[PDB]
């Protein structure tokens, strides 16, 4: 530890005030929205809600492309296949369901139901069209083969429930954050844990890779967001405000990695300059907890879902 | 007007999808969510089976072949007069001394959220049993923030039982701590609390040989009366209410009760009545 990150970026120009306005508002969910995932095309997005509905939406025109009825209304996570053919949903039923969007009878039907975990599914993220990695409240992360239907790898080092998962850009490493305040970097091919980080003092509810892939950020029930390097193997910064005392539901980066956007239980989202750790903007549209925050692959917009059942696109 | 021919067809699809969402929401709100909390009595999970027999649902031979292995597993688990000092199945004597009875008393832990739909008087409810979750409740308790009622099930014959795994801790004091912790939750501030007291018959026999005063010093009654013990226990539970304005509905269930559904309806109807009175500023 030669120096702190804030000492090196002391002589850098501040971002300045960030102003973002709702350019769209997606209405239709009738219950709390728990999860959202943008598509790779950067126009389509999927969102999951407790009324038992998974909805694919066109962002540009606010049009609803697809509406999928789920078997278990208790869903906590949502994912969109990088190709665009598939969506995955899971929740308190302990099953990860894969549905196909580009099927030839017009309807969206379930392709496979992956049932190996004993705890609730908290996150799932497609690795290819045939490989998905899921995190569970049973303290274990599993890498599956969608065609066969069997989990090829299990990551078991965690002691508390795993709440969030994030895949590296190269899709060879991922990081998981757990209820024991530890985040672990897991190698997907070997199946072991390369590193563990323990800077937080309460449950980690959110985790996200920096665009470079050599860093990541966590958000916890304690109000702080923490940035952790992978090569230095140490915490770099903490993003906290005396006024902020609520939990952090979701965290995500900007395309350049200069802005870190975090969704809070104070009903509003914050935008931090990730290199000076000083708050730069707010997103105050929602009137309930901001449950999901996702930025696009090109950085054009930021969608925020919430427990008031509306999604909002900001730019 | 600025839209193309295909853009207009896309908007027509988004309008049909909106119509279907609204119709689904209309269908959904006519259902009332009841959250059954998992205690040690609920962990045993025999009361739910017996109440199911009362509804009329039964077991085919296939289902009983399902429970064969569980029966044998239970004999071994129990084996591996002084029941109250340690943890033991309630039905060890009957086994050591499959029929429908054998099916009923196979104490089995449950994997995840199990939902029971039941319809009474044009009102349909869903009983969401969360007993077998076995994961941090701080991370999934919000899901049921908005529910009509949080049902609880505690046994009346639990006052003398001290479990071996605890270091001399009374099981009833454990159920009281759980009850207080749940009802103090800010998520359920708008939700009714229903409490069911079970094992009514087992108390009628247990009270004669076991004095409640020995385990709880406050009790001052006949010392051989089950009626006085029941009322004292219900008083201990109801006293935990931290509001004093919210009702805590109660019932004494004997495992042969055929009024557990009617009571749940009458408690839900009165929950709704009070919510209405509060919103119309009458109360």
């Amino acid at each position, epitope marked *: 530890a030669d120096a702190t990150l804030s000492q090196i970026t002391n002589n850098i120009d501040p971002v300045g005030r960030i102003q973002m306005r709702t350019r769209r508002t997606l209405r239709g969910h009738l219950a709390k929205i728990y999860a959202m995932h943008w598509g790779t095309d950067s*126009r*389509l997005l999927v969102s999951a809600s407790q009324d038992g509905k998974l909805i694919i939406w*066109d962002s540009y*025109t606010t*049009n609803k*492309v*697809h509406a999928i009825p789920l078997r278990s209304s208790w869903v906590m996570t949502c994912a969109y296949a990088p190709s665009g053919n598939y969506v995955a949903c899971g929740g308190l039923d302990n099953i990860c369901s894969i549905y196909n969007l580009k099927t*030839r*009878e*017009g*309807n969206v039907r379930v392709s496979r139901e992956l049932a190996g975990h004993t705890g609730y599914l908290s996150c799932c993220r497609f690795l290819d069209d045939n490989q998905i990695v899921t995190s569970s409240g049973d303290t274990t992360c599993a890498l599956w083969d969608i065609e066969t239907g069997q989990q090829t790898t299990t990551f078991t080092g965690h002691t508390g429930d795993v709440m969030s998962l994030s895949l590296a850009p190269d899709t060879r490493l991922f990081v998981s954050g757990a209820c024991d305040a530890s985040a672990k970097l897991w190698d997907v091919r070997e199946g072991m844990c390369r590193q563990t980080f323990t800077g937080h003092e309460s449950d980690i509810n959110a985790i996200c890779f920096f665009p470079n892939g050599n860093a990541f950020a966590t958000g916890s029930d304690d109000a702080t967001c923490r940035l952790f390097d992978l090569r230095a193997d140490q915490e770099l910064m903490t993003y906290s405000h005396d006024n902020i005392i609520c939990g952090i539901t979701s965290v995500s980066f900007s395309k350049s990695g200069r802005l870190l956007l975090a969704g809070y239980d104070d009903f509003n989202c914050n935008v931090w300059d990730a290199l000076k750790a000083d708050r730069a903007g707010v997103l105050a549209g929602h009137d309930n907890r901001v449950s999901c925050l996702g930025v696009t692959d090109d950085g054009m917009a930021v969608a925020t879902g919430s427990w008031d059942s509306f999604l909002k696109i900001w730019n | 007007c*600025t839209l*193309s*021919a*295909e*853009d*207009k*067809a*896309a908007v*027509e*699809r988004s309008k*049909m999808i909106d119509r279907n969402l609204r119709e689904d929401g209309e269908k959904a709100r006519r259902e009332l969510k009841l959250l059954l909390l998992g205690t040690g009595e609920s962990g045993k999970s025999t009361f739910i089976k017996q109440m199911r027999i009362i509804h009329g649902s039964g077991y085919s031979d296939e289902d009983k072949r399902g429970f064969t292995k569980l029966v044998y597993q239970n004999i071994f688990t129990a084996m591996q007069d002084r029941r109250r000092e340690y943890q033991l199945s309630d039905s060890t004597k009957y086994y050591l001394n499959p029929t429908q009875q054998d099916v009923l008393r196979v104490q089995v832990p449950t994997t995840g959220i199990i939902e029971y739909p039941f319809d009474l008087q044009s009102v349909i409810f869903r009983m969401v049993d969360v007993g077998g979750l076995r994961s941090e409740r701080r991370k999934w308790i919000h899901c049921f923030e908005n529910v009509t009622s949080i049902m609880f099930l505690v046994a009346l014959s639990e006052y003398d039982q001290v479990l071996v795994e605890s270091d001399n801790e009374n099981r009833m004091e454990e159920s009281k701590a759980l009850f207080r912790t749940i009802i103090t939750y800010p998520w359920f501030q708008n939700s009714s609390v229903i409490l069911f007291l079970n094992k009514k018959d087992l108390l009628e026999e247990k009270i004669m040989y076991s004095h409640l005063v020995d385990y709880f010093p406050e009790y001052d009654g006949p010392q051989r009366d089950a009626q006085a013990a029941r009322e004292f226990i219900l008083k201990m539970f109801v006293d935990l209410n931290p509001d004093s304005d919210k009702i805590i509905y109660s019932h004494f269930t004997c495992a042969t009760d055929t009024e557990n559904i009617r009571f749940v309806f009458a408690a839900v109807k009165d929950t709704i009545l009070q919510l209405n009175l509060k919103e119309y500023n009458l109360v």
Partner: single-chain antibody
Amino acid sequence: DVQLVESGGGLVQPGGSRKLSCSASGFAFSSFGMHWVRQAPEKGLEWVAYISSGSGTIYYADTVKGRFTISRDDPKNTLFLQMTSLRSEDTAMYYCVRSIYYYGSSPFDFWGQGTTLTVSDIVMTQATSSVPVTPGESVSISCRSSKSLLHSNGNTYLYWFLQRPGQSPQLLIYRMSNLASGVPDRFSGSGSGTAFTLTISRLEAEDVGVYYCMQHLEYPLTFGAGTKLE
């Protein structure tokens, strides 16, 4: 899998009325809009009618508007086309065509076998009708439009179909570049606002047939004359 099988054609005395019907199988019929298209005995093919998903929208061809009626029994999975006051321009082969419209879909992807009926805006032009080419040589077909088919949304609404002798039309390319599912990567499409070109590299015997361009920017849905490869 997906089958549309129409029925109701035959020999009709002039001035009578006939009702056609396509029965659908193997797909979510209720979520598909439908078209009727018709082909003259020896000429190209022309759009006839379009009923929307949920029946909210109906468009008829100016030629038959007011004498034709289109209806769909979504529960029974059928599509009907009532025809009254049968003129002698109604001798044609009637093909049921399903199409679905959302961001990224491929309309006109499946066509039906067709029924024979015998009774006793934008113009799209292809200035060629016979190009005999040996297998193994690149073939470029051209098609021109009256106005720009490029909309403000950046989409150029030109579709390319193929008609094999004794077979129903089949979609090759939609919106000027995209390839339909199940077509070989040999077929490619590239066009300016008013001029469009379809190129078939490594020609094979299966490619021989009549190629039709079509527009979807406005609702006349005007096809082309067709370019034939022999």
